[PDB]
Amino acid sequence: VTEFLKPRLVDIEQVSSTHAKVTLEPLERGFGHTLGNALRRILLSSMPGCAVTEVEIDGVLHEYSTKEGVQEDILEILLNLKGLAVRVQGKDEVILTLNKSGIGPVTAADITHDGDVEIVKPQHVICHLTDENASISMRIKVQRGRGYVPASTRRLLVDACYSPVERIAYNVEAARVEQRTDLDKLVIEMETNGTIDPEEAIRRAATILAEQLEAFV
Amino acid sequence: VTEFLKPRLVDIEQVSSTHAKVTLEPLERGFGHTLGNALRRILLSSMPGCAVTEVEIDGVLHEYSTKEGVQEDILEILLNLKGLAVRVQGKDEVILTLNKSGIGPVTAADITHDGDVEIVKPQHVICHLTDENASISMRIKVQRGRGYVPASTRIRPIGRLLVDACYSPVERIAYNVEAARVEQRTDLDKLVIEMETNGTIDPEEAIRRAATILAEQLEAFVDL
Amino acid sequence: KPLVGTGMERAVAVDSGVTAVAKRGGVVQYVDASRIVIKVNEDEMYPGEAGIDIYNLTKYTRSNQNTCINQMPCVSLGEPVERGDVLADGPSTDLGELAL
Amino acid sequence: EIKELLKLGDLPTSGQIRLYDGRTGEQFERPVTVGYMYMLKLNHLVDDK
Amino acid sequence: IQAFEPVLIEGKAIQLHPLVCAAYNADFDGDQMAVHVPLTLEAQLEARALMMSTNNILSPANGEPIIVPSQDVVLGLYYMTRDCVNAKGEGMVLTGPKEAERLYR
Amino acid sequence: ARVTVQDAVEKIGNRFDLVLVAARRARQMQVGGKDPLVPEENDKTTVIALREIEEGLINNQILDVRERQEQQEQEAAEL
RNA sequence: GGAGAGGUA
Ligand SMILES: [Mg+2]
């Protein structure tokens, strides 16, 4: 009376590396909803992660302005910076410079390396330049965090997106171990920002959740 | 940062014989709903119960007949017996016996109990004998099971009567989250779980059971 | 019983033949799942041939639609009863009022 | 009179109360109507057909 | 009348994909249905290539589709694509629908 | 799995002769001792024949060519 | 097998 179907196999489908579809089965009736839901919340609600925090522009001190020689607008570049993805070691918060001139799409490689701080997506565009004689310099402060704070909670500032996941879903469905066909089967599709493989994110989340309730064994 | 306060079981308020309350504290932001929903589902889902399974009355052949002296149908007796509450200590299956004569109701207390089988509701009525020289004897079968099991789906003489199994102590589970009073911190949560069982289970034991169940189930995902 | 009736329930129940409705108020002298006996009230009793009222109950019997029908007593010993009051609940009835 | 009777109980006079989902556990917005209803089981059984 | 692939179920009632109900004009108030099976190979191919549900989407009477989301899904969608004048989290900016989903969740 | 027949109809834009040609191929396959041309995935013969039609490596004309060729082979196999 | 009565969508 203390025996339960531990899933086997644990199979996987590998869409492009930043996107996976894991299939687990056969689970005891009803456990699918609880397991899938909890993992979902943990993944997309609380997860360690550092993301950009705020920015300052050399020639702009107000968001409702415009710089010349830049194709886009302040809000657009701010959104791009929000879409940034970086990882940092023990250094909690860092500041980086993006001085550059000349016509061209200013992508992520243009930022100073600053050692341990690693940009995961160099191709990520940030803005464009329209006058070859135009320039742009800016200082960006990144800081570590867990969740997601909007701007209203608190020299420009940007919302922080600490969580690295992007999309998660699941659809429990029936299965049968040779009998007792009232059994379920979980299918988790996940798509991350690429800072870590989905399979590893699942292991991290499971570690967190399982460890939380340690005091009840 | 990157560290989370581990909840601890603070108090168990046995507000009544059956109604009970439990408190978990502290809890990091957002976890209250997670754990509360999970534990509610687990507790309502699976718990070892000890419902009755079979009956064997002396002078009857099938549940659709009647017995002289008793003023209720056999089906009524079986129905009432189905709602019985009891605990067993060591064995996974036991046979109780009931004998009674004279006029009056027949509480559960009229069973010749042993030191390992313990009734929880001695006053539970069964049937009303309406004649002094009218007696009833019966053998009850109690098994240890889980969840629901209709009599149709299981697996001998013509005297055995089979009832449906409902091995579950719990009946209603609710919970709330609320801010704690830690030395210095905000958005720190404290969970209160209100439960109402039939009375044949220790709340703390139930919580530990559910928690170990959930952890054991979850441990599959790690180290794929 | 339906929580929200239109009040026409007892009429339909009693007027139908299923339930065993007392005919002369009295006292339950002995009850059983099968039969009932009533010591008649002193006044309702006829001068000659006192006797006492008695009822027998139709147990499980197939209906016209293959649905079993039987009756169950709804009173205990020593219960005073009055003329025209219900005694045995028939199918889909509760305390002498319709309950489907 | 229904309103008054309800208020005799401690129930919301509006009749609609908030609810919570079984699976997710989160509240439903848009307070919902609930109560009690008398229902019958008709004589057209699936097994017969 | 239409072809389908079967999926076994531990019940005694024929499940039915709800969208086709409009085509069948079939309420669930106790309407019954009848089942046939094609025996020979040619029958199976005819069914698959002509009578499969996925092949009949426009009414022959007129090019109008015949799989209109009938009554409930339509309500859900209409409720989804509405806008309160001042609701929680207004005026902000998002970097794609995935962020919208995450925010709402 | 097979859910549509649109590509097969594209290969053969009549939607009736499609059934007949597929049926003849699947009949060669089932009772006739023939083999498929596409890796099957534990699927029945009808869907397999339909997929063959889809890839265009089997149509009515090629079927006529093959049946005539094997008829000539059989007429040359008697000696 | 055929009549008649009732009933469901
Ligand atoms: Mg209908």
d(CA B13, CA B4): 26
Pull the structure tokens for residue A185: 């089967």
Name the 3-class secondary structure at A87: strand
Residue B85: how many other CB atoms lie within 10 Å: 19
- DSSP H or E segment with residue C68: strand C68-69
d(CA A155, CA D16): 49
Question: Residue length, chain A?
Answer: 217
Measure CB to CB from residue C3 to each of D36, D40, D43 and give the nearest one. Answer: D36
In order, the DSSP letters of chain B are ----PPPEEEEEE--SSSEEEEEEEEE-TTHHHHHHHHHHHHHHH--EE--EEEEEETT-SSTTS--TTBSS-HHHHHHHHHT--EEESS-SEEEEEEEE-SSEEEEGGGB---SSEEES-TT-EEEEE--TT--EEEEEEEE-EEEEE-GGG----TT-EE--EEE--EEEEEEEEEE---SS-SS-EEEEEEEEE-S-S-HHHHHHHHHHHHHHHHTTTS--
Question: Best of B4, B37, B191, B221 to disrupt the A interface by mutation (most A CBs within 10 Å)?
Answer: B221
Interface check for A194 against chain B (CB to CB < 8 A): the answer is no
Q: Are B59 and B139 in contact (CB under 8 A)?
A: no
Residues F4, F5, F10, F16, Cα dihedral to 10°: -150
d(CA B19, CA B173): 10
d(CA B101, CA B174): 44
Q: Name the residue among A117, A99, A11 with its Cα closest to residue A59.
A: A99
Q: Are A108 and A119 in contact (CB under 8 A)?
A: yes
Per-residue exposure over B159-198, b if at least 16 CB sit within 10 Å of its own CB, e if not: eebebbbebbbbeebebebeebeeeeeeebbbbbbebebb
d(CA E64, CA A155): 57
Name the 3-class secondary structure at E35: coil
Count CA within 13 A, CB hemisphere, residue C67: 9
Name the 3-class secondary structure at C29: strand
Residues with Cβ within 8 Å of A154's Cβ and at least 6 positions away in sequence, in order, are: none
d(CA E37, CA E17): 19
Read off the CATH number of the domain in which F68 is found. 3.90.940.10
d(CA A43, CA A196): 13
Tokens 């600053």 locate to A114
d(CA A41, CA B35): 11
* Nucleotide nearest to E30 in CA–C1' terms: G9
CA angle at residue B39 from B37 to B44, to 5 degrees?
95
Q: Which domain holds residue F48?
A: 1-79
Contact C59 B71 (CB under 8 A): no
Q: Are B197 and B173 in contact (CB under 8 A)?
A: no
Residue F5: how many other CB atoms lie within 10 Å: 23
For ligand 1, the distance from its centroid to the CA atom of residue E65, given in whole angstroms, is 23
Is E83 labelled as part of a ligand binding site? Answer: no
How far is Cα of residue A150 from the mean position of the Cα atoms in its chain?
A: 16
Tokens 């189905």 locate to B82
Residue E36's identity, in one-letter code, is H
d(CA A112, CA A137): 12
Q: Is the peptide bond before D40 cis (omega within 30 degrees of 0)?
A: no
DSSP β-ladder status, A135-136 and C61-62? unpaired
Q: Name the residue among C29, C69, C25, C18 with its Cα closest to residue C43.
A: C25
d(CA A49, CA A145): 6
Residue B184's identity, in one-letter code, is Q
Residue A106: how many other CB atoms lie within 10 Å: 21
First and final C-alpha spacing in chain A: 18
Measured in degrees and rounded to the nearest 5, phi and psi for residue A71 equal: -65, -40
| Three-state secondary structure of B121-172 | CCCCEEEEECCCCCCEEEEEEEECEEEEECHHHCCCCCCCEECCEEECCEEE
* Nucleotide nearest to E32 in CA–C1' terms: G9
- DSSP H or E segment with residue C9: helix C9-15
In chain A, how many H helices and how many E strands?
3, 17
Residues with Cβ within 8 Å of F34's Cβ and at least 6 positions away in sequence, in order, are: F28
Method: cryo-EM
Pull the structure tokens for residue E49: 């290539």
* Nucleotide nearest to E31 in CA–C1' terms: G9
Interface check for D40 against chain E (CB to CB < 8 A): the answer is no
Burial of residue E30, with CB atoms counted within 10 A of its CB: 0-12 exposed, 13-18 middle, 19 or more buried: exposed
Contact D24 B36 (CB under 8 A): no
Burial of residue E37, with CB atoms counted within 10 A of its CB: 0-12 exposed, 13-18 middle, 19 or more buried: exposed
Count CA within 13 A, CB hemisphere, residue C14: 14
For ligand 1, the distance from its centroid to the CA atom of residue E20, given in whole angstroms, is 15
Name the 3-class secondary structure at C20: strand
Is E29 labelled as part of a ligand binding site? Answer: yes
Q: Are A148 and A165 in contact (CB under 8 A)?
A: no
User: How far is residue F51 from each of residues A79, F5, F58, F66, measured CA to CA in Å?
Assistant: 47, 9, 9, 18
Residues B44, B47, B51, B54, Cα dihedral to 10°: 110
How far is Cα of residue B216 from the mean position of the Cα atoms in its chain?
A: 23
d(CA B163, CA B171): 20
Q: Are C86 and C95 in contact (CB under 8 A)?
A: yes
Pull the structure tokens for residue B224: 């794929």
Q: Are A48 and A207 in contact (CB under 8 A)?
A: no
User: How far is residue B77 from each of residues B87, B102, B129, B163, measured CA to CA in Å?
Assistant: 21, 18, 12, 11
Interface check for B3 against chain A (CB to CB < 8 A): the answer is no
Q: Give A186's strand partners.
A: A24
d(CA F53, CA F45): 12
Domain total in chain F: 1
Q: Are C22 and C85 in contact (CB under 8 A)?
A: yes
Contact C33 B67 (CB under 8 A): yes
Question: Best of E17, E40, E44 to disrupt the F interface by mutation (most F CBs within 10 Å)?
Answer: E44
DSSP conformation class of E95: S
Strands (E), A99-145: 100-101, 104-107, 118-119, 125-129, 135-136, 138-145
CA angle at residue A24 from A19 to A28, to 5 degrees?
145
d(CA D15, CA D27): 17
d(CA E95, CA A79): 6
DSSP conformation class of C98: B
Greatest alpha-carbon pair distance for chain D in Å reads 48
Q: Give A129's strand partners.
A: A70, A104
Q: Give C57's strand partners.
A: none
Question: Best of E5, E7, E48, E52 to disrupt the F interface by mutation (most F CBs within 10 Å)?
Answer: E48
d(CA F27, CA E42): 9
Q: Are C88 and C32 in contact (CB under 8 A)?
A: no
Q: Give A13's strand partners.
A: A21
d(CA B154, CA B169): 22
Residue B199's identity, in one-letter code, is G
Residue D49: how many other CB atoms lie within 10 Å: 9
Interface check for C34 against chain B (CB to CB < 8 A): the answer is yes
Chain A residue whose CA is closest to B39: A34
Contact A82 E95 (CB under 8 A): yes
Pull the structure tokens for residue B62: 């099938």
Residues of E in contact with F4 (CB under 8 A): 52, 54-55
d(CA B83, CA B119): 12
Chain D residue whose CA is closest to A41: D24
d(CA A121, CA E7): 45
Angstrom distance, C64 CA to G6 C1':
13
d(CA B56, CA B35): 45
Residues with Cβ within 8 Å of D16's Cβ and at least 6 positions away in sequence, in order, are: D31, D32, D33, D34
Measured in degrees and rounded to the nearest 5, phi and psi for residue B25 equal: -170, 140
Interface check for A83 against chain E (CB to CB < 8 A): the answer is yes
